[PDB]
Structures are given as C-alpha cells and as structure tokens.
Amino acid sequence: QYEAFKDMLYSAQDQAKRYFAKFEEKFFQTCEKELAKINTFYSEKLAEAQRRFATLQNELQSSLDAQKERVQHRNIKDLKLAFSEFYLSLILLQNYQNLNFTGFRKILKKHDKILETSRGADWRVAHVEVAPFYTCKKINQLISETEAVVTNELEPAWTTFRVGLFCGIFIVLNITLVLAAVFKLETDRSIWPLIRIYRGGFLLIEFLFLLGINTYGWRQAGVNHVLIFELNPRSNLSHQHLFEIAGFLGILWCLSLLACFFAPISVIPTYVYPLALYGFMVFFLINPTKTFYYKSRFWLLKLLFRVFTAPFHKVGFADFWLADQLNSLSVILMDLEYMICFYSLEYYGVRAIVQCIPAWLRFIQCLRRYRDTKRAFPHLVNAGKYSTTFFMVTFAALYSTHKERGHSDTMVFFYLWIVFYIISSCYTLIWDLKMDWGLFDKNAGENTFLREEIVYPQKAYYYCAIIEDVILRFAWTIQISITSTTLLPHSGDIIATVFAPLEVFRRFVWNFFRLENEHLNNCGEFRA
Amino acid sequence: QYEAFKDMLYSAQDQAYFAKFEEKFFQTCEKELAKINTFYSEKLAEAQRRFATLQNELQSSLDAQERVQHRNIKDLKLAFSEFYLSLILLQNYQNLNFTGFRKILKKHDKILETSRGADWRVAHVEVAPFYTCKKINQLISETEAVVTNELEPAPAWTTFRVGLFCGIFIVLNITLVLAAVFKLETDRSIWPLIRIYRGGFLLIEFLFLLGINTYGWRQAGVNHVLIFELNPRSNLSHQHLFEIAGFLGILWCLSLLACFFAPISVIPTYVYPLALYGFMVFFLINPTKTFYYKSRFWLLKLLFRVFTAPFHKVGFADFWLADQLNSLSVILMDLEYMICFYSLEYYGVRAIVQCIPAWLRFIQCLRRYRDTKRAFPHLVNAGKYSTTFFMVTFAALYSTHKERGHSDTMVFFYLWIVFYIISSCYTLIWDLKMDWGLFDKNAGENTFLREEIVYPQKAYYYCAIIEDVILRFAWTIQISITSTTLLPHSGDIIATVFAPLEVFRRFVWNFFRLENEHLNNCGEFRA
C-alpha cells in the first residue's frame, strides 16, 4: 500500500518528539505487516511455479520419449503454449519482486526525508533487503531453466526521426567538409597543424556513436547492461538516444569547423569558433535545468565526480567502466590541455602528467578496490598493469629530453623504453585476452579457444576480434609514447591523430567483450 | 473452440457421410455461438451496471467539490482506468470470436467445397447479438469522454529514412540559398532558365503536402482508404509519401547544385536537368517489382486511365487526379518549354498544353453526364471548366492583337476582364458550395458551416475560407498571364512565386473536399 503509506506520512507531517516518536513505531509496524504479506504471497506463488515447472517438464519429457503422430503433434503445440503462459507467470512474479522492493526502498526514503532521519534506510537494510522475497533468486533460476528448455527441446517514433535527421545532416556536412578542405583551402601556412590538433570533440562524438552501437549490441545479444550498470529498468537509455545525442554533438562540431575554414561575419574572429563549440558542449553537459536528459546528465556528472576522486568513495562497476573508458580517451585530455596552453600563450612537463592521469586514476581506483576487498589477486596485477604505462611514459619523456639535449645516457633510456614498450604491451594484451574477456578457457572444447558459454551468434566475431586487438594494442602503446613527443617533429602529430579513432574502435570491441564476460561470468567480483 | 473445429474438419476429411458431418458441425457451431452470446450479454450487462455505479460515484465526488476528496479522485481515476480496460477486453472478445466463426466457416467451405458455411455465418453469426450489439462501443466512448472531461504504427526503419531525407533536404536547401546569394558570379541570362525549370520542385512540394493530407486524413477520422478504394487492407501511410518526397527532393537539390557548381568539365551544364527528369520518370515507370512497385503501378494505371478518360468509367480517383492536374498546369508548361528549348537549342501551343488538363477534366465530366444522364451537378461543372478554355483563348487573342496593334485591343481587354471575373466567381462559388459543402442552410451552431464538423477547431475553416477567396483570384490571374500577354519580364517571376501558392491552395482544397466526401456523398461515387 504505497499510496496509503505516503498518505500516512503526509498526515503525520501536517498533524505535527513524542508525537513523531509514537508515529515512528506505527508505520514500521505497518511496514512489517506489508512486508510479511508480500513475503508470504511471494513464497506461495514461487512454490506453485516450482510445482508447475516440474509437472510441465515431466509432461514434456513423457511426450519427447514417445517421439524418440497427430496426437503427438497436438501435444507439442499444447506444451509450447503451456511453457509460453508459464513463462509469462514467472515474469509477472519476477516483476512482482521488483516493484515491491522498489516501493519499500522509495517509501522508506521518503520517511527519512520527511522526518529527516536515517532510521528508514536502517529498517530497509535490516528487514527488506534480507527478506526471502528479495533474497530468493529461484525466480531467475526458473526463468533461465524454462528459457533453456524451450529453446533446446521445443524450438519512440519522434526519437527515431530525430536520429535520422541528425545522421543525415551529419553525413552531408561531412561531405561538405571533405570537398571544402580538398578544394577551398587556399592556405599553405601552418593551418593543418592546429585544426589537426583540434581533433578533440570529434573523437568524443565517434566514441558516443560507437557507444550507441554497443548499447544496441548488448540489448540484442541478451546481456542485460541495465542490471550490471545498476540502472533502473524504467528509465533505460535505448541506443537511439545515444545515436541522436552523438548526431547532435557532431552537427555542433562540424558547423564550428566549417565556419572555421570559411569566412563567417568578419567581426567574429576565426579563433573563437572552437571555443564556442567547447563551451557549448560543457554548458550542455552541465546544464543545471531539468530538460535535455537531465536525469542522465546528472547521473553522468555524478559518475565523473566519483571517478575523479576515486580513493575516497567505494568502487562500483560504473566507476571501473568509466575509468577504463577514459584510459583510452587520453588524447582528448591532451588536446584540452594544449587548448589551454596556447590560448594562455596565444615538455613544461604538464604534457606527460596530463597524458598519464587516466592511468593514475585507474591505478588508485584499483588500490582502493584492493583495500576494501583485501585480496592481492587480481588487484595487484592490475596495479602493475596500470603502473607500467606510468613507467613507460616517464622513460619515454626522459629519453626524449636526453636525445634532444645530447646526454650520452640516451641509449640506456632507449633500451628502457623499448623494453617497457613490450613488458607493458604484453601484460595489457594477456590481461584483456584472459580476464577482461575470459578467453583461453581450459573448459572449452567445442568452442576451441573460447569460453564454455557464448552469447554472440558467430564465433568469427571472437576470432577476428582477437587478432585485431593484438595488432592494435601495440599501436596504443606506441602512439601514447609518441604523443610524449620523443622527437618526431612532424610525422608524429599525424600518426597520433590517425590512430586515436582506432583506439576508440578497440575500446568499442573491448566494451562488447567485457560486458559479455561480466554478464555470464563474474571475473570482477562486483556482485554479491 | 477454433482448434476443436479445425480438428473435427480434418478428421472428417481424413475419415471420408458429409451430410451427417455437416449437421454435427453446424450443431456444434450453434452451441458455441449460444455460449458466446450468453457470456457477452452478461458481461455487457455487468459493464453497464459498473458504469452507472462509477458515474454515480464520480458525480457525488464532483458535487461535493480536502484530502478525502483528493483520495477519491485518484481512486475514481483508477476505477475508470481498470473499467476502461474491461471494455477493451470485452471488445476484443467480440472481435476474436466473430473472426473465429468467420475463419472456421470459410475453412468448412474450402474443405467441403460448399457455400453452406458462409450462408450459416450470415444467417447466425452476423445476426448474433454479440456482434450486432454496439453498446460496447457506446460505453467505450462514454468512458473516454467522462475521463477526458471530468477526470482530466509506422516501422522504425521507414521513420529513420524520413528523418535522414528531411535533414539532407534542409541542408541542401540551405546550401543552394547560400551559393546563389554568394557564389553566383554570372550576370547573364541564367535566372530565366533555372527559374523556368522550377518544375519537378513543384511536384515535390505537392508530394510533401499530399503526405500531410494523408496524415491529417488519418488523424481526423476520415478514411481516405475507403473513398479511394485502394486495397483496403493495404495502405500508404503518410511516412511513405514523406520519404518518397524527400528522395525526389534530394535528387532535385543535387541536380540544381551541380548546375550551379562546376562538376567534372567533361559533363556540360545543360544535361543535369535532363538527368533528373529522366531519373524521375524512370523511377516512376520502372517495370521491376521493387521501390513501391504496387503503388507505382497503381499510379501508372490511374494516369493512363485519366489521360484516356472519355472511354473509361469515371471513379473517384480519376476525379481527384484530374482536379490535382488542373492546378498543376505549371509543370506541364515547364515540360513543354524544356522540350521546345532542347529541340531549338505564338507556335505557342503552350496555350493548348496549358489547358489540356482542363480538357481532360471537362470531357471526364461529360462522361459522368452521359453515363448518369443527370445534368446537375455535372453540366454546371462542365461550364466551370470550359470557362478556362474561353478565358485562355481570349487572353491569347488579346495578346496577339496587342502585338499587332489592331483597333480592337481595348474592347478585347474589357471582354477578357469580364470573363476573368465571371470565371473566378463561378469557380469560387463551386469550391465553396459543392466541393466543400459550406454555407449549409441547416447549420445554426456552426455558423456558416456544415451541420457536423470533423476537424477540431472551426478557426481553420474560418481562415481557409478567406485563403481560398483571396487565392482563387491569384490562380486565375496567374494562368491568364502565363499565356504571356505581354509581361516580358514581370510575368515569369509572378508565375513562379505563385505556383507553390497554387499547390498550397490545392492542398487545403484536398483537406476540405475529402472531409466533405466522407460525411456527405456530394460526389455521387458510392452506393
């Protein structure tokens, strides 16, 4: 009785220590009574489902044994419907469990807000979270069993229109960019090596686009990203939303660049359009209003705030995901730093530290994880894996310094860098192929060099992904070292650019496989 | 028990006598019909009792109209919400069982190769109370109205295509505007060529507006599908018209941009419009079975029928397309100008080719008179459309005599002006009285409207009326001048800026005429 709970809370508030205290026992007693009712009704129906499952399975087994004609054919059709309706019941009970749990959580939160007390959350954790109706996973077990048995034995418009709009405008504007740059760029001076470094928000845009594709892939394959990301099922962000938002940012970026090449109103200088774009982006993200996906924007901002101060807060799954995401999205941070730099002016070493900061964040997050769980494995291995990049980049910078300046110790540091370009790459590759993806499983015979259970349709996906990741991991390390400007005056600003999109591509594939593994296996002990 | 009847039929076929089985089959059919009829009635009676109770509770709650009252309103909202669901379930029960009797009985006919199943359906099922009883719909409507007053699908892929084409089209239009404004360093005779090739653009604008017509018709309640008799089960939703229009738009914009810019020099400037007008017809005339082969084939058949109207019977679709082509004469003039110019680079047959849609429509009306023999409202209509003939002829004669300078130019000017006014008046009154049905005597509350009204706000009628009044004058003057009286340079611009306005006029005219044809049978095309 959620609504009547709310009515009681409002009546107590309006009818207002002894008064509040006496009211406190009453609602808890009401909460206890409702909890028992839900617990009882849950247990009875759950028991009924188990009996029905047994009866259906025996009937299915008996029908199959005779099969191993018309009377049999009708029975199979009858059985399929019986499991179909039965499957619906399990979902209903499965939904039943969530709604009551949500109501308890939400209503007890309101009592806390109204009475400005923490007793509600305490009662929730003491009673509701431990209640059999919530702690009983047999509903999921039954659902999975029914799905497997059936599969084996028996067998918004406006948003989409907006997505189409933005995608079409983006493609046409992109063709416009290509034509203009090829033809209407009558500037032989140092113009490429500036816009070429404004390849910032572009990487962000394509990253969002690939993220939308990731969402679609997880949805279609079956991996439920909503549970692992601790997102509520009632406000899920379909891949269409990511697509439209990516298209919108793309339109903004492309209008900015196109204006930059051409000559809009002369009163406006050419060096403000990138500033306008990047200011509009940040304002849109930090829009304090309640429009334009305020829920999702607030959630993302809270995630970022937690992530950038990882050592203090507990590490959730989203924390780890965003940290690894930013790990490959370092070039964006480097570009932002360079932005600030030459605008303030137009290795003092800030380059390297800003480049490696994502690695620092992930490493310290892993340290916090280890401190909280207090188990060396696998956390210490991650600490080493993410500190190797620190060591590699610092050695790269020092080698650059000595080689340019002239010190004969340059060779030693060259050797150091080349070894840390392998002893680092190898750890990354082996980890992504063994734990984050879980492949090379001993207990996998039919799937060859895969895991025992597979979700995605064709194994060719896994086989090609392995080799592409192998070839591109070394590219990540070499590119991140190069961006530390070893010397590479002019051939480096181009290779880093042409590889950053490849980095995001690798992150796209890695997202697929990491979430697949987590959905099937635990690897990272983040649940339970 | 549909599956049971199917099994009985299959067993009878396999065990094949038939006369005895037919008696058993129909007897079982009757028993099920009685069961369905009885269950429907008691549920319907229960629903009627529930509605009165809830309505009584709502009225009592409304009459007293704090927390107690607020609680009741929420409960009543829920009570009506669940109550509404019950009617839908009962409505579906009615729909499903009737379908089952219909689909089972046809199987009985097919399997036994007899027509007795359809006869039994008509005799028993189609007269059963559970089917004829419309009280379910009345209760549904009453509940909807009560809730709203007192208490308060296109495929994804096609929608995405519509969005993509719309975005590309808007960007291309922006690009053309900027290019013409800035990068047009040609002060020679270029405007009076692309301007007069403002053709297929008019067709695309018409298609876009027609998609809007489809959307509005579907939303209002007017069923364009029945009155167009276009494969009732099938349908071309407004999304499809939108996407096809967007595709033609992308083609048109690309062609004009190429003409403005300088693509590969080997290809000359004068061929891109040829390419566009060839591609459009090829897509329209494609023999293959893709890219809307059904709809394109239907449109081709309609065009062939209408262009040879005097031989064929006149259905509504012929009428509608003839009236559409009446307004879209500018495209025909543009096509004629294109053919003549490409052949050469008042013979002024342009006048004929301009009036020929009127010839089509007028002879079609005559056919509608020879097959029904009732003059009004046809002969009058024939005169309406022959006014176009006479007006254009007088305009051409006046042009010729002004060029020659005979001492009769002023008198012919006066005569052509008088005939202009009379033709405009007659077409206006015809549009306002018959094609729309407004100024109905039996309409008191609706003021100068028809007795019933479909569209939500009368304001749209009250405005479109004056829009038509002011724009019919424009159509007549545009067609008159388009006969190039003298108007050396001041004419080709007004015709161009008015042709889209003509399409807009025809758009609103389509709204109103189909709205009228639904309610009334002013166009005697049914029954």
Swiss-Prot record, chain A:
Swiss-Prot/TrEMBL catalytic activity: phosphate(in) = phosphate(out)
UniProt GO cellular component terms: plasma membrane
Effect of residue 386 to F: Decreases phosphate efflux
UniProt family annotation: Belongs to the SYG1 (TC 2.A.94) family.
Site feature (Gating residue for phosphate transport) residues: 476
Protein residues bound to phosphate: 324, 327, 385-386, 473, 506-507
Effect of residue 479 to A: Decreases phosphate efflux
GO molecular-function term, one example from the UniProt record: virus receptor activity
UniProt KW Transmembrane keyword: yes
Membrane topology: Multi-pass membrane protein
Species annotation: Homo sapiens
BP term (GO), one: phosphate ion transmembrane transport
Phenotype for residue 161 to G: Decreases phosphate efflux
Disease field: Basal ganglia calcification, idiopathic, 6: A form of basal ganglia calcification, an autosomal dominant condition characterized by symmetric calcification in the basal ganglia and other brain regions. Affected individuals can either be asymptomatic or show a wide spectrum of neuropsychiatric symptoms, including parkinsonism, dystonia, tremor, ataxia, dementia, psychosis, seizures, and chronic headache. Serum levels of calcium, phosphate, alkaline phosphatase and parathyroid hormone are normal.
Name the UniProt record assigns to this protein: Solute carrier family 53 member 1
Curated annotation (Swiss-Prot), chain B:
Effect after changing residue 484 to C: Decreases phosphate efflux. Decreases phosphate efflux
A GO molecular function held by the record: inositol hexakisphosphate binding
Tissue specificity: Widely expressed. Detected in spleen, lymph node, thymus, leukocytes, bone marrow, heart, kidney, pancreas and skeletal muscle.
Membrane-traversing stretches: 154-184, 190-221, 235-262, 269-290, 314-345, 346-373, 375-405, 409-436, 456-487, 490-527
Stretches assigned to the EXS domain: 346-527
Presence of keyword Transmembrane: yes
Impact reported for residue 505 to A: Decreases phosphate efflux
Effect of residue 384 to A: Decreases phosphate efflux
InterPro entries, alphabetized: EXS_C, SPX_dom
Effect annotated for changing residue 399 to C: Decreases phosphate efflux. Decreases phosphate efflux
Effect on the protein of changing residue 435 to A: Decreases phosphate efflux
Important for inositol polyphosphate binding: region residues: 103-110
Effect listed in the UniProt record for changing residue 160 to G: Decreases phosphate efflux
Segments dipping into the membrane without crossing: 291-308
GO cellular component, one term: plasma membrane
Outcome recorded upon mutating residue 368 to A: Increases phosphate efflux
Site (Gating residue for phosphate transport): 475
UniProt keyword terms in alphabetical order: Cell membrane, Disease variant, Membrane, Phosphoprotein, Transmembrane, Transmembrane helix
Extracellular-facing ranges: 185-189, 263-268, 406-408, 488-489
Impact reported for residue 350 to A: Decreases phosphate efflux
Result for mutant: residue 110 to A: Decreases phosphate efflux
Role of this protein: Inorganic ion transporter that mediates phosphate ion export across plasma membrane. Plays a major role in phosphate homeostasis, preventing intracellular phosphate accumulation and possible calcium phosphate precipitation, ultimately preserving calcium signaling. Binds inositol hexakisphosphate (Ins6P) and similar inositol polyphosphates, such as 5-diphospho-inositol pentakisphosphate (5-InsP7), which are important intracellular signaling molecules involved in regulation of phosphate flux.
Illness: Basal ganglia calcification, idiopathic, 6: A form of basal ganglia calcification, an autosomal dominant condition characterized by symmetric calcification in the basal ganglia and other brain regions. Affected individuals can either be asymptomatic or show a wide spectrum of neuropsychiatric symptoms, including parkinsonism, dystonia, tremor, ataxia, dementia, psychosis, seizures, and chronic headache. Serum levels of calcium, phosphate, alkaline phosphatase and parathyroid hormone are normal.
Quaternary context: Homodimer.
PANTHER family xref list: SOLUTE CARRIER FAMILY 53 MEMBER 1, XENOTROPIC AND POLYTROPIC RETROVIRUS RECEPTOR 1-RELATED
Name of the featured protein: Solute carrier family 53 member 1
Species per Swiss-Prot/TrEMBL record: Homo sapiens
Gene that encodes the chain: XPR1
